[PDB]
Amino acid sequence: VLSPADKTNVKAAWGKVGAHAGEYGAEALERMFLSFPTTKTYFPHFDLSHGSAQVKGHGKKVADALTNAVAHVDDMPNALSALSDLHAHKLRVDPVNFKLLSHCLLVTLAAHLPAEFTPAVHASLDKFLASVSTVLTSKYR
Amino acid sequence: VLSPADKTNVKAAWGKVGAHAGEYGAEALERMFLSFPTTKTYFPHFDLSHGSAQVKGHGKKVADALTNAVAHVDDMPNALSALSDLHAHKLRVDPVNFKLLSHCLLVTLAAHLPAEFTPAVHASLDKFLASVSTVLTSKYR
Amino acid sequence: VHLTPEEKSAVTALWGKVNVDEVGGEALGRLLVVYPWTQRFFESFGDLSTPDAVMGNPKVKAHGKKVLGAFSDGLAHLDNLKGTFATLSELHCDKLHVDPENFRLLGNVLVCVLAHHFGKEFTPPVQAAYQKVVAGVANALAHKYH
Amino acid sequence: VHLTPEEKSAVTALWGKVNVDEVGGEALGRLLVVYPWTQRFFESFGDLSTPDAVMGNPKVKAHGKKVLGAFSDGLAHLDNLKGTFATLSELHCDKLHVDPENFRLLGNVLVCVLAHHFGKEFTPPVQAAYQKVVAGVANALAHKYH
Numbered sequence: 001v002l003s004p005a006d007k008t009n010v011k012a013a014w015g016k017v018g019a020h021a022g023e024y025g026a027e028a029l030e031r032m033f034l035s036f037p038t039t040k041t042y043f044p045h046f047d048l049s050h051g052s053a054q055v056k057g058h059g060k061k062v063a064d065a066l067t068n069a070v071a072h073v074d075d076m077p078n079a080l081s082a083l084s085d086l087h088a089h090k091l092r093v094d095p096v097n098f099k100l101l102s103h104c105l106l107v108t109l110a111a112h113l114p115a116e117f118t119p120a121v122h123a124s125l126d127k128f129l130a131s132v133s134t135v136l137t138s139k140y141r
Numbered sequence: 142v143l144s145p146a147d148k149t150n151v152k153a154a155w156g157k158v159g160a161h162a163g164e165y166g167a168e169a170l171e172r173m174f175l176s177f178p179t180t181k182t183y184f185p186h187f188d189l190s191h192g193s194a195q196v197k198g199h200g201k202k203v204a205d206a207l208t209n210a211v212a213h214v215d216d217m218p219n220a221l222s223a224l225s226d227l228h229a230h231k232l233r234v235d236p237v238n239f240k241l242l243s244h245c246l247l248v249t250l251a252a253h254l255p256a257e258f259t260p261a262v263h264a265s266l267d268k269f270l271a272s273v274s275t276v277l278t279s280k281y282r
Numbered sequence: 283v284h285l286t287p288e289e290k291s292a293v294t295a296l297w298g299k300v301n302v303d304e305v306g307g308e309a310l311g312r313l314l315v316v317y318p319w320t321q322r323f324f325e326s327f328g329d330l331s332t333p334d335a336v337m338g339n340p341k342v343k344a345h346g347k348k349v350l351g352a353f354s355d356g357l358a359h360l361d362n363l364k365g366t367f368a369t370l371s372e373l374h375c376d377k378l379h380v381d382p383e384n385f386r387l388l389g390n391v392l393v394c395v396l397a398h399h400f401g402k403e404f405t406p407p408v409q410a411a412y413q414k415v416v417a418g419v420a421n422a423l424a425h426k427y428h
Numbered sequence: 429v430h431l432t433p434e435e436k437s438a439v440t441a442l443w444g445k446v447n448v449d450e451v452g453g454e455a456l457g458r459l460l461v462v463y464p465w466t467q468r469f470f471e472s473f474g475d476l477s478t479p480d481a482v483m484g485n486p487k488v489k490a491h492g493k494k495v496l497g498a499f500s501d502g503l504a505h506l507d508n509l510k511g512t513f514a515t516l517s518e519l520h521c522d523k524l525h526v527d528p529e530n531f532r533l534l535g536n537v538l539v540c541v542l543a544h545h546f547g548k549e550f551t552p553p554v555q556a557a558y559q560k561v562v563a564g565v566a567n568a569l570a571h572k573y574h
């Protein structure tokens with residue numbers, strides 16, 4: 001569960017990301033495809049090379065969903081309900097991949113937010129991303 | 142989430158197990174230690190010799206907790222609350238190991254329940270054991 | 283994989299008793315029932331709408347037997363699983379786009395199906411040897427991903 | 429676990445700029461903060477009660493130096509990681525009783541620390557090379573478990 005301090009930390013860090021949310025989402029995806037090539041199996045229809053409009057567009061979608069989750073941090077199962085339906089019935093990404101994307105989001109944030117990515121904030125962000133991932137895989141079976 | 146059908150399947154299967162639960166818990170632990178030797182890293186203080194009474198004692202505790210979870214299948218977080226506290230604060234077993242024990246529990250059940258271990262019951266038991274595991278790791282951080 | 287001489291013997295002995303029609307259909311069928319999202323890869327197989335429909339589906343049964351055929355090749359060449367499965371690894375990546383995490387799921391469903399058939403005969407040491415086998419097969423099938 | 433020649437060059441280039449002592453303490457510290465159950469192995473190190481208590485703990489920092497020293501040494505032997513880490517694998521299994529899943533966790537925490545220190549210089553291709561490294565090290569440290 002996210003503590004009061006976790007929620008403060010996530011709001012502060014994601015707020016600092018600010019206008020960069022879409023850029024960072026796309027960067028995390030790129031880092032994921034390069035670092036963990038098995039994740040590319042879910043995107044046979046994408047150009048996955050650097051500067052891909054498809055990866056940029058998808059990064060924006062991912063980032064905007066995270067922004068919505070932060071906005072509804074105390075009601076994520078419901079705020080993400082439609083998205084979790086899509087994941088369970090269409091996308092059907094194995095749960096391990098959410099941990100890979102989450103890690104790449106942390107790496108992205110670390111690379112951009114030197115002062116803000118403290119050990120406590122890193123901890124809270126990891127919990128937050130795991131919580132989002134849990135909601136998104138909750139309806140699989 | 143466990144559906145009414147899952148709850149029916151789990152109650153019927155565990156009901157069949159009955160007084161064999163403790164024996165099957167020990168068997169699942171033995172299967173786990175042999176199949177996944179890294180799990181032994183949590184038991185260096187145990188006697189792990191063949192037919193170990195200490196392993197059998199532990200199998201009984203694991204089994205009894207599962208019997209309780211089945212009896213309280215509508216509210217597992219509450220029934221397992223004290224146990225989840227102990228896992229989070231003392232035992233501190235990495236979450237990956239729960240999947241290993243859960244698999245070995247399924248193998249044990251499959252080996253002892255020729256008639257009962259249908260595809261649907263297999264699915265329900267797998268969901269149940271994953272749900273127990275989730276509750277047991279829920280307070281880790 | 284790094285099976286001991288005695289585990290190699292035990293795996294071979296058990297496999298000589300395996301009914302591939304039954305075990306192959308049961309393993310693939312249970313993959314699709316227990317982890318229903320894996321049905322995404324098998325839409326062309328037709329009716330997968332209930333457990334009975336999955337288990338009785340002629341294409342699931344036929345395909346499960348083909349899968350076990352490849353496993354048998356693995357068991358016959360335990361010291362070079364990577365070589366044995368190279369072509370199939372390339373296929374599953376490049377043509378089929380199958381996340382290799384699924385290979386671990388199938389491996390453990392197969393172990394459950396062997397336990398279900400053999401009962402007490404599927405002893406803890408025999409299981410341990412088969413876990414090495416299915417991990418080795420999954421790792422070999424994952425090896426040519428890129 | 430096979431890095432390309434260009435990835436090897438990238439790894440070596442970046443590592444030359446690493447303060448191995450500092451980075452080791454930071455990685456082990458963040459492991460204990462982000463995954464606090466891992467503190468189970470370090471009871472003897474004293475105060476681990478808060479993020480600052482962990483990160484600034486001198487015993488955590490000193491231990492991080494050993495860990496990163498051994499990692500640093502592994503970078504010189506990227507084609508024989510299993511052999512390189514064999515005695516440490518045996519030690520972590522037989523004497524220390526450390527679940528090897530912890531090596532995977534620490535590897536990814538180390539990647540986060542490298543990103544934090546290097547910023548934009550820790551590019552996606554550089555990360556991908558380091559991910560091959562930490563996966564190879566974790567796999568090597570796990571290899572002699574029994």
Ligand code: HEM
Pocket residue numbers: 320323324326348349350352353370373374378380384385386388389419420423
């Ligand atoms: C890990 C053990 C596995 C083995 C040994 C194996 C083996 C095979 C073989 C022999 C074929 C037929 C190839 C041909 O026609 O040339 C095949 C096809 C296929 N496999 Fe696998 N497989 C494994 C796991 C999986 C898993 C886990 C999935 C997905 C969840 C999968 C998805 C597919 C698909 C979609 C096909 C094509 C089926 C079609 O004809 O429509 N495989 N596999």
Ligand code: HEM
Pocket residue numbers: 466469470472491494495496498499516519520524526530531534565569
């Ligand atoms: C890159 C991965 C790692 C490397 C290269 C590494 C290396 C080392 C080295 C060189 C030592 C000193 C050995 C000795 O005392 O003879 C050591 C000790 C130890 N390591 Fe690791 N280690 C790694 C990861 C971990 C992790 C992730 C944990 C647990 C979370 C861990 C737990 C321990 C413990 C408990 C000791 C003994 C500490 C003490 O003296 O009290 N290691 N490690």
Ligand code: HNI
Pocket residue numbers: 039042043058061062065066083086091093097098099101102129132133136
């Ligand atoms: C490695 C695979 C993978 C992971 C781990 C992942 C993890 C996540 C996470 C977790 C933090 C979030 C918030 C997220 C959000 C989204 N994903 Ni993800 N997705 C993944 C693969 C996809 C795929 C595939 C699509 C469809 C893309 C397309 O355009 O075809 C997708 C589509 C979406 C969309 C667009 C849905 C729509 O059309 O309404 C959103 C938003 N997502 N994905």
Ligand code: HNI
Pocket residue numbers: 180183184199202203204206207224227232234238239240242273274277
């Ligand atoms: C691989 C390690 C491992 C796993 C996955 C695991 C999974 C589980 C599961 C999951 C289905 C259940 C129901 C369960 C139940 C229990 N465990 Ni587990 N335990 C594990 C390692 C332990 C260890 C270690 C202890 C302490 C034993 C001792 O006697 O020192 C333990 C103690 C317990 C106890 C006794 C608590 C007490 O003293 O009051 C119960 C009950 N458990 N354990």
